[PDB]
Every structure is written in C-alpha cells, then in structure tokens.
C-alpha cells in the first residue's frame, strides 16, 4: 500500500553518501546547506511554510537513495522546491526558482547547475518522483503543534510563548535527519516538551487531565520519554554547534 | 473538411398512417396517406383512387388528423412532426393551380420532459375545441383551437398517471373528455378525465376506473349512438361506459396480436380490426333498443373476414372497398363482399401498391452484363418477405420475388449463377413437442433441402423449456437462381441458431467459391450470445455441402473477405482467419477494443469497425507483423446502424436517431493523437433508418455518360423502403451548391413553415447541431420545379469560384443545366 519513510539513526551510517567516502559530519553539513537553501529560496519567493517543508522532506528522503557526490545538492534542492510547489498548490515557474538561486549562491556554488540551470533541474524531476515513490502527500509537525496547542487552556501569553518557541524548533529540525527518524506528530510533541522545559512551564496543568504528568500521551500514543529526549538532544546540538542560542 | 451530396433515388414507400375525410372539397371523399416525410392526397372513386396532390414536409409525420371546426366549409389537416413541429394545413385550388396553405404553425416542444414509451399520441376533440398531445410522460398538452391561436400556443396539465398506453377523446360528453389506458405496478387500468380550457386542468371524469387486460393496447372512441369506449387487448375486447360493461374473448384473436382498428359504420355498429399475421376481422356492435327509446349495447361479436397485408393503418373508404396501409409489406385496396368465396373468404384483392418494405440488406449485381447494375434487396418481414430486383428504365422497374418468410442478408455468387439469402421463418410449439409453421414459405418449398447435423453444441446439458403456442425462429440459407429466382436449395440451421452474416468468396489458394455464414446460438436466458459458428458451404451441382465449421465464443455479427482471408466480428472481438490447405480456418490475429463490433467494411489493408455505441474505428492490418493496429477512432458516442468507407480518408456512418455523419483522419501528423482522432466533418439528419450501405449505381453506363461533378457512388436502403445515394463533391462544387441552398430556402415555401435548416440539423434527444458537409440534393433538384420568377430571384448576385473564371455570375439557364446533370446520377 504505502512506503516506509522512517529509518533508525544507526542506519544513517550506511547512506549512499557515507559509503562513497563522505564522512558523517560532511553529509550532515551538506544536508543543512541543502535544506537551508530550499528554505531561503522559497522564503524569498513568498512560499508557505508547508511548501518549504515538503521540499525539504523530499530532499532528505532523496539522499537516502542517492549520493551527494553524484547529485549536486543545490540542484536537487531547487528541484524539490519546484515539485513541492506543485504538490502543495503554491506553484512557481522553474525559471523563477533559478533566478532566486543565483541571487543567493556564489559562482562556485551556482556551477552545479551547469551550463543550463533550468534543464538540469527539470530533468531531475523524473528521478525525484521515482525516488519518492510518487508518495507526494506529506504531513509536517506544524499542523500538530497547532492541533495540540488548541487543546491547551490557560495563560494566553504563556501558551503563545510555548508555541512560538516550539515553532522555531520545528523550523530548525528541518535541517536534520529527524524528519527521517520520527513521524511529524512525535516531532510536534518533542518541541512542545523542549519549550516547556526551557520556559519552566508544566504543560499537564493546561490539559484536560491536569494530574496526568505525561501530558503528551493524550496526543500521541506509545511515545516514551526516551524518544522525546533523543529529539531534544538532537535539536539543541544544532544550537551548541553553531553560535546561535535557544530563542527564549 | 469533407464535402458530400445526398439524394433520394426512391421515395419512402411504407405507409405510416392514413385518414379519410373531406379535405380537398367539402364534397369529395379524400384519402390522405402518410409516408415518412411525404403526404399523398387521393380522391375516392368507384373504381379506385384518383391522385390529386403530393407534398413533402421538412419533418417526419408523427400525427395526422382531419377535423372541421364550426364555420369551416371543409376539413382542415393537423400534422405534428417528430421534431415537435405543429401545423394546420388547408387545401386551396384555383383552377389548375393546387397549393397547400399553412393556416397555423408552431413548435410544441418542452424544455424539460421525458419522451413517452408509446410515442407521441395526437387526438382531436369531437367538437374540435382542442387538440390533445401526449409528448412527454406525466404531462398532457392542450392546444386550444381558437381562431386567434395561429401560433399554436399551448399549456400542459399535470397527469398523475405516468405510463399511458393509449388515449382518445370520447363522444357524447358534457365536457371534453379523455379516456385512456395506463400502466402502474398493479396492472393496466382504464380511466377518464374532463378537460377544462377555462381552468386549464383536469376535473373528475364521467366514469370510474376499471381494471383491464394486462396487454390492453388500443382505445376506440365509440360514436354517439352507443357512447363510451372499446379496449382491445391480446385475448379480449371490452366495452366500457359508466355502469355498462361487456367482454368478449373469442379464441381466434388470441392467436395474433391486433394492431390496427377502423370504423366502418359512422354510428359505431361495425369496426375493422387487423392483426400481425395479416388477418382482417369485423367487430360488430349488436344493438338493443328499450321501450324508453334509448339505444344500448347488447353484445359484441368478432367475425373473421379474410387476409390482407400486415397493416399499419386500416381505412374503410366506401361501398366494399378498404385501403390496407402496410409498413412491412405491399399496401392494398381490397373489396369486402357480403357473400364468401368458395374458400370461405370475404376479402378479394383489387390493387397492389409497391412497398419496398424494410430493406434489411441489399447488393448491386449486373445480371444482364449491362454495365448498369440492378439492385436486389431483402425486403419485407414475415409473410411479406420478398426479394426485389430494381433497375432504372422515367421510372424504376421493380420485380418482386415472394418468400413468405423474413429475408435477412443477401450476397451474389457469380460462379454459381445464383444468390445466397439468409431467411428466418416463424414456427409455433405444437402438441408433438416440435414446431409447426403457420404457412409454407421459401425455406420449405426449396427444390432440394438439408438440415444441419453439427455436434458442436450437442453436449448441451443446458435446459430450455418449451410451452405450447410459443414462437420460435427457424433460420435458413436459401440458394436462389439469378434468372428464374427459383429457390434451388434451402439449408436449415441448428435449433436456436440464428444466421447473422453471409459472404461469398474464395479463400487462400483454394480455387472453390464458397458460401460462408456466421451464426449465433441465442437462448432467451442469455443477455449476449456466447456460442456461435462460422460455416463454410459449397454450392455444387444443385446441392450444398458443408466444407468446414469453426466454433466461436460469441455471435458472428459481420464477416467480410480480406485479401483471401476471412475477417469476422465475434462480439467484442474482430478476428482474421486464414484458410489452410486442409480446408480449415486458422486464426491469424485479433483486435479486442470494441464493445460490440456489429459492422465491418474493408478497403485494401484498412478496416472500418462499427460499434453499438463507440461509433466507428479505423483499423489496419499490418502484414509485416501479422496483426492489427488501431489507426483512428471517432470518440464521439453514437449508436451505429450501418457504416461505409467512402475513400482512404473519409468514412460514412448512420445513427439510430435517423442521422448521417462522415469522419475523416485528421491528417495532421504533428502529434500521434491527432492522427488517432477521427473528426466528424459531416453531419446530416436523413430522416430515415439506414440498414445497408452498398457501393454501386443503378444508372445505365454506355461509357458515353458525361463525367458528373459528383464522384463516387454509395447506395443505401432504409426501413421505410427509401433508397438514397451519397456521393462526394469538390470544395468548389460544394460551396456553389451550398450557397444555392441558402438562396433556395429563402425562395421555396415550406409546408407548415418548417425551416429547412432546422429539419436537416443533426438531432438526438440530447443534442442538436447544424448540418455540415452535406448538400441536400433533394433541395437542389427542386430548383428545376420552381417558377421562372423564382429561378431568377435565386441566381441574383450568385458567383462561382475556383473555376476557369475565378468569379463568374450565374444565370437561371446556367443553373438549370447544372441541376439537370445532377439529376442524372440516379
């Protein structure tokens, strides 16, 4: 019926890119760069956050089946965004994505698009579709962050601070392989969990079961804290590696 | 685009309706006979009919009735066409000049309505206060006959009874009253209503509903002396009038369905009845007068008079003379005698009017080697079945070969100097367990005969029970001599085997010429046949010998010879068989993208497939590969009745809606899809049901015949006996003739004021499109019959194109010559 789009962390040591001699740090960097390229290009074009995320999910999934050494990331990224725009009904012309790509990329980087940027992209659409097994519908943590937050009742301002902080954590998680490890529903809970810890809020009080200390179990069944902590650890690592700090 | 020309070679001959009255003069007795689109007016004499006038109408005559409103000297004519055109007509004669006046005209069609199953019924009040129409289910339409309603405006009355079998206005009522038979789940009933022009609704009717026979078919309005109505069924005849009820159920009428009725005595004492086996009855109303002075109906009696042709309409004229109007056989004048003849019959035939009947199939053959071509048609049904040989010589010469059974397909085999004809005859389950034929016919009167002994389906084990009295069809192949037209041989097919297709040809390297028949095993239980045979026969030395048989899993609807191979359609499949050196059929290749491949035509290595609903497909045999390839299809959905190939690019079809169309390859090779799309470039409402398309012409060719502007020749036969001809034009000749039509239509006065452009518009219940790509030759040929002032009016400002002179004005004498050449193609 439907394909399996989730892998174990241990499995990422055997991605095509890794086995071709790329080390773990480089593939991680290449993934951040490609995702952020997709994010930055689409934001300049005025694209909805779902459209940006769908492209990034296509992108991440793609490099589970192909190596970064044989498929230039920025071309792949542009192709993902081009298709995502059609999937999410926020379409853009391929020429316009290329135009925006040149604006943000340097000459060395734009060399990936070769002599004919539009062609290199439009040609990849075939491989993209076959690679993502024509499974185009994608759900993202955003919708669950809002579906769950709507069921919280309490201080309007404390809950809005939780949502925005969690929303930021969602945008940041798009640069990672979490999209490939855990369903979006779990991601939404993890970012609520993380923001709750950081803001020193006790979310159970805002739920319909205020004496249910594992507040998330009413939103997402069968999630151990082990998972939410693994996700939080991975998100905050991005902040520690960079110069940026937690939004608070 | 494509350009084509369509003319009538023989007008419709089947009688669709007939009425009597005082139409031409308040003094004369008239007979108005309606053939499809044609009205014939006669005057009754002591010997026979005197023709006086014939008109064509731009419509199919669905309703025809004569009435005389107070203040008129003579009867007026009401006609309704199948496209819902209404008109009131008057005969006017000024010395030698006879013309038909359109007193009122209009279109009675509703935007929303469901066409009735039993068809348009049209009736007129005895006081000529209104015209009743039943055009749609659940609605009764009233045209009030006031002096001011020259536009024939009308209103609908909601009718609770949705499924109405028949309706008539009654005599002897205080208000306009309708009596009708209707069907609901509980059975059939008879019911009455009163019609109020003032309130524009029904009021309670004069007498209560009565439950009637399940197959009650017709309503007869009995005249003032008795009043009330008679209801005719399959087994019984009943009279209803308030409290009075009679029922006679004589066993004689149970044998054959009664289809037509007429009144003999204006007072209602005697009515004529006819049935599908051609028997003519007298229905007698036995009167009883009470001392009160009141006349009542004592009893009903049915008396058998004799045999006529199977009759669509009966009308009694005067003295002993009755006009028998026949749609399945020749129409007649017959005299009813008071004394029976020595055989017991009171009916003696006076005159016989040729009816080409339903033309199921036909072929063109030059019997006398004359380079002319004669047309041998399969005509009629049942007792009226006939072969008709037609030649040109200025009238058409027609010979009739009586068969007394239904002819189905015909093919000519020159090697044997004879025709092969498929036929079916009706037998009835009798008390022996077998069947008995109602009358001897061609298949039983053959010189030599044979019966199939095939064991292909003999395993059976499938039960099919038989009840005494049920009908069955018995199918035969008839071998008929081309000079005497004597039945030389008859081969009876298997029980429940229907013969659907017939070809005569040589196959492969086999020098023998064979008769090949494709059959279907039809059992009442089956929706679609699933068993069938292809049988190879050889007619040799007066005997028919079975050479080979091929079992198939369906009905062989159509077979055609394909370059020494046999092309057959079995249900959805189109198959190509090879004829081996072992005299057996071997399948070469198949095509399956058909719903029901009913019709097949070939040209070279190209095949035209006709489908029950998918219109036409252009197949090709690819010899390098040994298989078929789809070339192009008409994706527009149409129900086909016959197809024909005009040339390598243009294809002709006929619709079950009485419509003709032409498809062409889109001839644009840019995309594969354009080549694969057959675009309909010609559309034309013929007004006839085309059964058979046949290449050929009936015109004498001495090799001296001037080359006409028209190129090609396709003849076609229709259900009403009409024979027509389709031919192609050059772009220039089309435009000239098309522009001339538009000029002629402004000049020529239409009966009923029916726009010619409307009449020929392609018309289905769902669609209406303007005609395209077709020249109504019957309009063009009428240029020669319009008066000189009108001729010159037509040619004013008329210019020719693409000729020797790019722009050349036309004169009335130039066009007379052009049309006269166009009349020489038939």
């Amino acid at each position: 019926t439907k394909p399996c789009w989730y892998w174990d962390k241990k499995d990422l040591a055997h991605t095509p890119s890794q086995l071709e001699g790329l080390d773990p740090a480089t593939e991680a960097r290449y993934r951040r760069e490609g995702a952020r390229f997709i994010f930055d290009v689409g934001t300049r074009l005025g694209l909805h956050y779902d459209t940006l995320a769908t492209g990034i999910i296509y992108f991440h999934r793609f490099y589970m089946f192909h190596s970064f050494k044989q498929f230039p990331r920025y071309v792949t990224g542009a192709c993902c965004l081009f298709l995502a725009g059609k999937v999410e009904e926020t379409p853009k012309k391929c020429k316009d994505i290329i135009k925006t790509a040149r604006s943000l990329l340097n000459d060395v980087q734009f060399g990936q698009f070769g002599d004919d940027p539009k062609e290199e992209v439009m040609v990849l659409e075939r491989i993209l579709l076959q690679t993502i097994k024509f499974d185009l519908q994608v759900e993202h943590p955003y919708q669950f962050l809002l579906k769950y937050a709507k069921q919280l009742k309490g201080d309007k301002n404390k809950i809005q601070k939780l949502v925005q902080m969690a929303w930021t954590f969602v945008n940041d998680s798009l640069c990672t392989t979490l999209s490939l490890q855990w369903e979006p529903e779990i991601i939404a809970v993890a970012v609520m969990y993380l923001a709750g810890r950081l803001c020193k809020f006790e979310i159970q009080e805002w739920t319909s079961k205020p004496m249910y200390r594992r507040w998330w179990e009413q939103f997402v069944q069968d999630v151990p804290v082990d998972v939410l902590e693994d996700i939080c650890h991975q998100i905050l690592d991005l902040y520690s590696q960079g110069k940026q700090q937690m939004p608070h | 685009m494509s350009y084509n020309y369509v003319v009538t070679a023989q007008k419709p001959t089947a009688v669709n309706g007939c009425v009597t009255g005082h139409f031409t003069s308040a003094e004369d007795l008239n007979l108005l006979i309606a053939k499809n689109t044609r009205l014939e007016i006669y005057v009754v004499t002591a010997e026979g009919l005197r023709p006086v006038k014939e008109v064509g109408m731009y419509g199919k005559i669905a309703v025809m009735e004569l009435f005389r409103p107070k203040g008129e000297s003579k009867d007026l004519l009401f006609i309704l066409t199948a496209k819902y055109n209404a008109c009131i007509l008057e005969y006017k004669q000024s010395g030698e000049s006879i013309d038909i006046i359109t007193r009122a005209h209009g279109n009675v069609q509703d935007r929303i309505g469901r066409p009735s199953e039993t068809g348009i019924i049209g009736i007129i009040d005895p006081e000529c206060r209104m015209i009743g129409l039943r055009l749609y289910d659940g609605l009764f339409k009233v045209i009030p006959l006031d002096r001011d309603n020259k536009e024939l405006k009308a209103f609908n009355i909601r009718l609770e009874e949705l499924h109405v079998i028949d309706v008539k206005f009654l005599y002897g009522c205080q208000a306009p009253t309708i009596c009708f038979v209707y069907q609901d789940p509980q059975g059939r009933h008879v019911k009455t209503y009163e019609v109020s022009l003032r309130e524009k609704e029904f009021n309670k009717g004069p007498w209560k509903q009565e439950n009637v026979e399940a197959e009650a078919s017709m309503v007869i309005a009995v005249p003032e002396p008795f009043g009330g109505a008679i209801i005719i069924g399959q087994e019984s005849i009943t009279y209803h009038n308030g409290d009075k009820y009679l029922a006679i159920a004589p066993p004689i009428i149970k044998q054959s369905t009664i289809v037509c009725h007429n009144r003999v005595d204006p007072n209602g004492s005697r009515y004529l009845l006819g049935d599908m086996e051609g028997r003519l009855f007298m229905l007698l109303l036995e009167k009883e007068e009470q001392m009160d002075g009141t006349v009542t109906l004592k009893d009903l009696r049915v008396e058998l008079l004799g045999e006529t042709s199977i009759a669509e309409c009966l009308t009694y004229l005067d003295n002993g003379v009755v006009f028998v109007g026949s749609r399945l056989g020749d129409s007649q004048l017959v005299k009813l005698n008071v004394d029976s003849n020595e055989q017991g019959s009171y009916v003696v035939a006076m005159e016989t009017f040729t009816n080409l009947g339903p033309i199921v199939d036909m072929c063109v053959v030059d019997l006398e080697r004359q380079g002319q071509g004669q047309l041998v048609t399969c005509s009629g049904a049942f007792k009226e079945g006939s072969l008709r040989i037609i030649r040109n010589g200025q009238k058409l010469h027609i010979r009739t070969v009586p068969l007394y059974e239904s002819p189905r397909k015909i093919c000519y085999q020159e090697v044997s100097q004879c025709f092969g004809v498929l036929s079916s005859r009706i037998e009835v389950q009798d008390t022996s367990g077998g069947t008995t034929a109602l009358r001897p016919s061609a298949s039983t009167q053959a010189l030599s005969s044979s019966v199939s002994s095939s064991k292909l389906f003999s395993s059976s084990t499938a039960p099919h029970e038989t009840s005494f009295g049920e009908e069955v069809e018995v199918h035969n192949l008839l071998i008929i001599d081309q000079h005497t037209f004597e039945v030389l041989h008859a081969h009876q097919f298997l029980q429940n085997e229907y013969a659907l297709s017939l070809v005569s040809c040589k196959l492969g390297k086999d020098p023998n010429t064979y008769f090949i028949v494709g059959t279907a095993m039809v059992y009442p239980e089956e929706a679609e046949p699933k068993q069938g045979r292809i049988v190879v026969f050889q007619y040799s030395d007066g005997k028919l010998q079975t050479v080979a048989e091929k079992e198939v899993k369906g009905a062989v609807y159509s077979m055609v010879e394909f370059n020494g191979k046999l092309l057959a359609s079995i249900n959805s499949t189109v198959r190509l068989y090879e004829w081996t050196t072992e005299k057996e059929l071997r399948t070469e290749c198949n095509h399956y993208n058909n719903i029901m491949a009913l019709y097949l035509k070939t040209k070279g290595d190209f095949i035209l497939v006709g489908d029950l609903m998918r219109s036409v497909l252009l197949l090709a045999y690819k010899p390098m590969e040994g298989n078929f390839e789809e070339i192009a299809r008409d994706f527009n959905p149409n129900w086909m009745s016959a197809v024909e190939i005009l040339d390598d690019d243009n294809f002709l079809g006929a619709e079950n809606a009485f419509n003709l169309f032409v498809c062409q390859k889109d001839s644009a090779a840019t995309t594969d899809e354009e080549r694969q799309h057959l675009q309909e470039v010609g559309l034309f409402h013929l007004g006839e049901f085309v059964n058979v398309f046949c290449h050929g012409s009936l015109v004498m060719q001495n090799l001296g015949e001037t080359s006409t502007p028209t190129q090609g020749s396709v003849l076609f036969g229709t259900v009403n006996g009409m024979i027509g001809l389709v031919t192609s034009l050059s772009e220039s000749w089309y435009n000239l003739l098309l522009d001339m039509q538009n000029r002629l239509n402004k000049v020529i006065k239409s009966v009923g004021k029916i726009e010619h452009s409307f009449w020929r518009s392609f018309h289905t219940e769902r669609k209406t499109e303007p005609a395209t790509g077709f020249i109504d030759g019957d309009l063009i040929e009428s240029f020669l019959d319009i008066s000189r002032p009108k001729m010159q009016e037509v040619v004013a400002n008329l210019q020719y194109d693409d000729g020797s002179g790019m722009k050349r004005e036309a004169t009335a004498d130039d066009l007379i010559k052009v049309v006269e050449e166009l009349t020489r193609i038939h």
Partner: protein, 329 residues
C-alpha cells in the same frame, strides 16, 4: 514491494486500444500480463517540459492515493516506458497511471441512447455517487468537474467517480482565490457563473442534482454555450438570482453585470411534476441558488429518496443487449 511506484515497466500490460484522449496524454485500455485484470493506462507526457510533470496528474495522484471508497476510482500503480539506460537527461519516456477498468462511461451510455433508468436504478446510482461525494467532502476535497463523462459504471451497477484533475482542498476557515470557472458549463453552479472564486463544496452538489434530473429526463437539463445563456436557463427553472433567495448575491462580482431577461419565479416542481415526490424534493434542495441553502452530500444521503436504499441490491440499469442490435419489425 507494492508501494515502490514509478519503477515497474509498461511492458507488464498488453495494450488493447485507446479508450480516450487526455489533454496531456492519450488513455489506453490494457490487460495485466501477470494477473489478467483489465486496467486503463493514462499516459502522462512530460516531454513538453513547459512546466514538467503536469499538475493535473499530480493532483490526481496526490488525492487518489489518499481516498479509499467503493464509489471513488482507484489508482492501482504508476509505471513507465523502458527508460534510457544511465542517461536521465536524454530520457523523455512517459509515465502511466494505472486505474481499474470500468465497463462504461455515463456520457457514452446516455449519448448512445442505450441505457434506461428506473426509479430504483436512479436510487442506487445516486446513493453511490453521493456516498462517494460525502467521503471526499468529509476529507475536505472538492471534485470541481462533475460531468457525466467522469461517472463510470460497471455492468454490475457499481458507480465510481473518476477525473480528479481539477480537484483541490477546501478550508472553511481560510478562503483563498480559486479558479473562477471550474465545472463544465452544463453542470456549473450559479455561483461560479457569477464568479464567486471562493466557492464551497456545494458546487459539486449542484452538478449532481443536474445529473439527477438528467437521469429522469434522459436529456441534460441546462444546455447552453454561453455563461449568460446558462444563467437564463437556470433562472427560468430555479428562479432568477435575487436578494431574497440569495442574501449575498449582491457581493458576487457579476451580479449586476449578468442579469436574466426577467426575474423568473421558481418553477422546478411544476416542470419536474413527472418526477416522484421523494426525488423531486431532493432536486429542489440540490438545485438551490444560494450555496448556503443548498443541501450537503450527507443531507442527500439522509433523504426519503436515498436513506432507505440498500446497496446490497445495486440494481443494474437496462444496458445494451443482443436484441438492441436487432430492430423491432
């Protein structure tokens, strides 16, 4: 696995013929070489490369892999032409969308004049269609092209909805500009003739009501070639758009621009008097001018006409037969 689409080749189907033409590719009937099942292959031609893979196909793939219903067409798989070996840039091969093959299409059955519908047949037809439409409308998807060409019927009496190319998601909370003209003119709602552009799922209900009437009359109800001419015909039967019956008609951009000849009164019940009462009420509600007063799909299923219909008895329509080939002398 069964889920890895786009890799299996079209070699696995024996092509029977071209059933129909699609704008981006031609549609063929084929048999599966391994199982024998009959399918229909929609050719998706990306060779144009004007904008790549057509969005119309993307929509139909995106939606149909989500929608599971007996009355919705199922996309079995997506297969490809023999791809060029190790040269994707040279590759121009097409993609094919596999769908279950259906015996007939309603437009073809009606146009040929070869189908008859009893009340009970119409009950089974409408109950299935509305159940499918309800399933889709509850998933917040809009068909937007409900024509007789997109209703497919097996000889069993099963109905399936088919062309989802113009289909898009509907959000009640957020209205955004959608395409102003989506349904074919004969089955187009009055709101889209006046250009609402922010339409409701009730647009699909209007089309189906037009079909409902056409099943009774055997002729389409509102046949016109021009948008204004359609409004006139709809206005004659359903009544002229006016503020009393459509409180928000004045907000529609073309209300003043597009006007019927007269302010016609509603005549639907009169002109469809022949229709049974249980059905006539369904028609009046389905063909309501105001999108808000127009009934929902669920409401049609909870109607006297359809609620007590058992789909166990599907009631096959009077479809072609051998006698239909022969003519009744």
């Amino acid at each position: 696995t069964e889920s890895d689409w786009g890799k299996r080749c079209v070699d696995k189907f024996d092509i029977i013929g071209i059933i129909g033409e699609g704008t981006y590719g031609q549609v063929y009937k084929a048999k599966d070489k391994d199982t024998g099942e009959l399918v229909a292959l929609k050719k998706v031609r990306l060779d144009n490369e004007k904008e790549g893979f057509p969005i119309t196909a993307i929509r139909e793939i995106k939606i149909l892999r989500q929608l599971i219903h007996r009355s919705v067409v199922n996309m079995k798989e997506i297969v490809t032409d023999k791809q060029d070996a190790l040269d994707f840039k040279k590759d121009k091969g097409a993609f094919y969308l596999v769908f279950e093959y259906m015996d007939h299409d309603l437009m073809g059955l009606l146009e040929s004049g070869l189908v008859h519908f009893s009340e009970d047949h119409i009950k089974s037809f409408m109950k299935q269609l509305m159940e499918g439409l309800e399933y889709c409308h509850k998933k917040n998807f809009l068909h937007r092209d409900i024509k007789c060409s997109n209703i497919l019927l097996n000889n069993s009496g099963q109905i399936k909805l088919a062309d989802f190319g113009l289909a898009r998601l509907y959000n009640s909370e957020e209205s955004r500009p959608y395409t102003n003209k989506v349904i074919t003119l004969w089955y187009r709602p009055p709101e889209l003739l006046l250009g609402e552009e922010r339409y409701t799922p009730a647009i699909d209900v209007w089309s189906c009501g037009c079909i409902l009437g056409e099943l009774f009359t055997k002729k389409p109800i509102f046949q016109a070639n021009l948008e204004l001419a359609q409004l006139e015909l709809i206005s004659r039967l359903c009544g002229s758009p006016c503020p009393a019956v459509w409180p928000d008609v004045i907000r529609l951009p073309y209300f003043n621009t597009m006007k019927p000849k007269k302010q016609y009164r509603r005549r639907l019940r009169e002109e469809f008097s022949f229709i049974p009462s249980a059905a006539l009420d369904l028609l009046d509600h389905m063909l309501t001018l105001d999108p808000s007063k127009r009934c929902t799909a669920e409401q049609t299923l909870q109607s006297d006409f359809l609620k007590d219909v058992e789909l166990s008895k599907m009631a096959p329509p009077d479809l072609p037969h051998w006698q239909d080939c022969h003519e009744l002398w």
